């Protein structure tokens, strides 16, 4: 997906966009040796309620 | 008279380093350092990937 903030910010007062979180818990722990990578990956929109 | 000695430029030793890479990492990207120093460091680093 990737709700582009263009719009999450300014789109009709109705529109029901389907943003989508990740569920990292079954994520693989990078091989104890291999060299690092270098872009932190973030998210700029968090749900405001549980 | 006694021709016993043969001229050479870059001599080899009766010993050397032999490494074995754990091809799992390494990248094969043959690390690229500077140019001036690529030559001095040059091989040691390529060998010690």
UniProtKB/Swiss-Prot annotation, chain A:
Signal peptide: none annotated. It is found in: Virion. Inner capsid protein that self-assembles to form an icosahedral capsid with a T=2 symmetry, which consists of 120 copies of VP2, with channels at each of its five-fold vertices. This capsid constitutes the innermost concentric layer of the viral mature particle. Belongs to the turreted BTV-fold inner capsid family. Homodecamer; each decamer is made up of two conformers of VP2, called VP2A and VP2B. 12 homodecamers assemble to form an icosahedral capsid. This is Inner capsid protein VP1.
